[PDB]
Amino acid sequence: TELKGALIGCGFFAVNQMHAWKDVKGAGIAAICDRDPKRLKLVGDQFGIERRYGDAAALFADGGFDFVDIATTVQSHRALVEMAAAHKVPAICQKPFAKSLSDAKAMVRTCENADIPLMVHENFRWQTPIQAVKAVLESGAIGEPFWGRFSFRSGFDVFSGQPYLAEGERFIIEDLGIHTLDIARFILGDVATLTARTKRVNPKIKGEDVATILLDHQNGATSIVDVSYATKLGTEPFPETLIDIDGTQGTIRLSQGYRLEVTGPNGMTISDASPQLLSWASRPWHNIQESVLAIQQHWTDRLSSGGETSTSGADNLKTFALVEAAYESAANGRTVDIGAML
Amino acid sequence: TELKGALIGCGFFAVNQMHAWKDVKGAGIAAICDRDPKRLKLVGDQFGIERRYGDAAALFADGGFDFVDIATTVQSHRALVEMAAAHKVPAICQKPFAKSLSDAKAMVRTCENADIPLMVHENFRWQTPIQAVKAVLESGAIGEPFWGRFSFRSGFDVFSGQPYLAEGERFIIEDLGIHTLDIARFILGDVATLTARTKRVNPKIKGEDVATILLDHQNGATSIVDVSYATKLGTEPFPETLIDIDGTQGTIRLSQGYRLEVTGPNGMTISDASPQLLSWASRPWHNIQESVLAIQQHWTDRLSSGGETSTSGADNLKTFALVEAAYESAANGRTVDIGAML
Ligand SMILES: NC(=O)c1ccc[n+]([C@@H]2O[C@H](COP(=O)([O-])OP(=O)(O)OC[C@H]3O[C@@H](n4cnc5c(N)ncnc54)[C@H](O)[C@@H]3O)[C@@H](O)[C@H]2O)c1
Ligand SMILES: NC(=O)c1ccc[n+]([C@@H]2O[C@H](COP(=O)([O-])OP(=O)(O)OC[C@H]3O[C@@H](n4cnc5c(N)ncnc54)[C@H](O)[C@@H]3O)[C@@H](O)[C@H]2O)c1
Ligand SMILES: [Mg+2]
Ligand SMILES: [Mg+2]
Q1: What span, in angstroms and rounded, lies between the C-alpha atoms of A211 and A213?
Q2: Is A185 helix (H, G, I), strand (E, B) or coil?
Q3: Number of independent structural domains in chain A
Q4: Are residues A282 and A215 in the same domain?
Q5: Are B341 and B150 in contact (CB under 8 A)?
C-alpha cells in the first residue's frame, strides 16, 4: 500500500528529493520526467526507475501514480499544477510557487475546485533547528513573542552550483529570502505590513544580493529579516538561518553551529539543535537535506490522514505575497500592505 | 594655566563627570550649581568644591569660570545654554540636547552668533570599543561599508538608579536609542531616511521600551538600530552596544564581552576592545565611565587648540533629528525624510 509518486524535473535538487523519497515510509517514486534526456537518464539510472518520460503531458496521459512531485524551475509550475488538477493527481510544487502572486492564487483556486491537495515544497521551516525554535516558542517557555531577527548572511559561492542565479534582474529575495520570510511567518505569524531595502554589491551579477526587511506582524510583534550573499566572515555559516526571539518572559537565541539558547523564568538552557546527517547527505547541506525527508514524510502522512499540509498552496500565498511586497517596497521606498494584496 | 569649569546639575550622572574632571589634564571644576541643596551639599562635599550655587543665574553673574558643564535634565538645557551664550561662556550640554529639534537649532544658532563653542555630551561613540570599530573601518580593512546592525538589548533595572524614566510618555529612544543612533551616524555617516517601530512591553512604565529602526544612509549603506529594555538574556550584556558591519571586502563583529572580529582579504583578526577601569569606576558602568573622561578631555583639548568638537551642537542636530523622526515614524507608520527636517 505505498503511494506511487511521479517526479517531474530531474534537476540538481531533485536528486535530494529522490533519495528522500527512498527513505520516506508509505510512499515511493514509480516514474520520472524531464525535458533534458541526459538528466532523465542520470536520475533514472541512479535511482532504478523503469518509467521515464520526456514530457509531462505523456506522463499524465499514462497515469498510474497517486501524487506528483514538481521539481522543475518556476516557468513550468503553473502548467504542471494545472495538469495535475485536471487529472485529479495530488501535487507538490517546488519554490518559488509561481512567477506572480496572481498565478499562485489561480493555482490554489484550481486545486481547491479539483478537490486535490497542493503543497509547496518550502523546506526551510522543516529544518531541525527551526522546528526546535518553534517548539520552544509554542511551549510558552518565553511568554508572548514581541520581537525577532531572522538572518542568513553568507559569502558562499552559490553561483558555481547554479550560474543562472547570477543572470536574473532579481536574485537573493526570490532564491533565499523567500525561505527566511517563510520562517518569519512560521515563528511569528502572518504579516500586516512590510518595508524593504535592496542593494547589489557583487560586481559580477545582475540581481540584488543584500536585502534588509522590516516586518510588522499581525500579533503585534516586530521582526527583521536580513539576508546577504556578500558577507565575508572568518567561519562560513552557509546554509544556517540564525534566529533571535524576545518574549515577555525570555529569549531564544539560535546561533552559528546549531546552538540553541533559551532563557526563561527558570534559568537558561543551551542545547544542540543540529540535524541528523543522513546516509546520503553531505556537509554542510545536511541541514537542508534532512528537511527534504521531513517535508515529504509530512506530505505522505497528511495525504493518508486527509489533513491540510503546513506549507499548503493556500498557506504559501502568505509567504509569496511577502516576496512580491519586498521587491515592490525596495523600488517604491514605501511600506506595503500585505492584507490588501491577498 | 588650568581652565576652570562650573558644573550645573549635581545629579546622579554628574558624579561621574566630576570624577572625570579631576582626571582631565588642563581643566578642573571651580563651582557647582544645583536647585536641590541636598545634591549641592553631597557633590560639593564629595569633591571639595567651595563655590556653591542654588541657581544658575547667580553663578553666571559672579563668573570666574571659562566654561560650563550642563548636566541637568532636558527641561532646563535651552535656558542654560542661552545663559552661557549671553555671558560668552563655552558650554557643554547633556543629552538629550533639547525637547525638540527646533529648540536645538536655536541653541546652535545663539552659540554661533555669540562665537562660543557648544558640545553635546554624547559619550557612547567615545567608548573604546566603538572607537575601535571606527578606526578599523577608516583604515579600509573591509572595503566600503554597505550594511550595519547597532544593537543594545538589555534586561537591566535602570529604573532603580533613576525612577523618572518609568514616568514619562517616552522612554527608550530619548534615553538610550539616541546613543545608538549617534553611533550609527558615527560609523556609517548621516541618514537620508528613517523608518521606526515601537512597543511597550514592561507593564510598570508609561513609555516605550522597545524600538527597531531602519536607516537609509546618505552613502547608500543600510542599517538596523534595535534597542530594548525588556530583553531577558542568560548573560546580561548591559551596557554594551553590539555592532555588525558588512563591507565589500570584509566584516566587523563587535560582540558581547568586547570581542572584536575583523575579517578581510588577509584573514581574521580577533581583538579585545575592552575598556579601561578607571580608579573611581564601577562594573558594569566602567565603559561609559571611561568615555566620560575621553569626551571631557576631548572638550578640553579642543577648547585650548581652537578646534571644533566631534559631538558639537551643529553635529548633534543630525543625531537629534533621528530621534524626533523615529517618534514621528512610529506614530504614523511612515518613512521620514531627515534632510527635510534640517
Ligand atoms: N531548498 C530547496 O528546496 C531548494 C534548493 C534548490 C533549488 N530549489 C528549487 O527547485 C527547483 C529546481 O531547482 P534545480 O536547482 O534542481 O534546477 P535545475 O535546472 O537543476 O533543474 C530543473 C530541471 O527541470 C527540467 N525541466 C524544466 N522545465 C521542465 C518541464 N516543463 N518539464 C519537464 N522538465 C523540465 C530541466 O531539464 C532540469 O533538469 C527550482 O524552482 C529552485 O528554485 C529548491
Ligand atoms: N551616558 C550618558 O551620558 C548619560 C547617562 C545618564 C544620564 N544622562 C543624562 O544626564 C542628564 C541628567 O541625568 P541624571 O540621571 O543625572 O538626572 P538627575 O535627576 O539625577 O540630576 C539632575 C539634577 O539637576 C538638578 N536640576 C534640574 N534643573 C536644574 C536647574 N535649572 N538648575 C540647577 N539644577 C537643576 C536636579 O536637582 C538634579 O539634581 C539627563 O539629561 C540624562 O539624559 C546621560
Ligand atoms: Mg520510500
Ligand atoms: Mg583635572
Answers
A1: 6
A2: helix
A3: 2
A4: no
A5: no
CB pair distance less than 8 Å for A334 and B333: no
> Which positions in chain B touch A253 (Cβ < 8 Å)?
233
Q: Distance (Å, rounded) from C-alpha A56 to C-alpha A6?
A: 10
Find the residues whose C-beta lies inside 6 A of ligand 1: A 8-14, 33-36, 39, 56, 71-74, 76, 94-95, 121, 123, 162, 288
Angle at B20 between CA B16 and CA B24, to 5 degrees: 165
| DSSP 8-state assignment for residue B163 | G
Does one domain contain both B322 and B213? Answer: yes
CB A69 within 8 A of CB A5: yes
C-alpha closest to that of A275 among A240, A248, A244, A245: A240
Q: To what resolution in angstroms was this structure determined?
A: 2.2
Pairing relationship of beta strands B210-217 and A118-121 according to DSSP bridges: unpaired
Task: Please tell me whether residues B20 and B165 are part of one structural domain.
Answer: no
Q: Which amino acid is at A236?
A: E
CA of B72 to the centre of ligand 2 (A): 4
**Residue B252: closest CA among B176, B334, B142:** B142
Method used to obtain the model: X-ray
Closest CA to A249 of A172, A149, A140, A152: A140
- DSSP letter assigned to residue B312: B
Q: Give the residue, out of B18, B35, B38, B73, with the most ligand 2 atoms within 8 A of its beta carbon, to mutate for a pocket test.
A: B73
* Cell digits of residue B194: 528613517
Which range of residues forms the domain containing residue B325? 124-274+313-342
- Cβ of A232 within 8 Å of Cβ of B224? The answer is no
Q: How many beta-carbon contacts under 8 Å exist across A and B?
A: 99
Q: Tell me if A214 and B197 make a contact (CB, 8 A cut-off).
A: yes
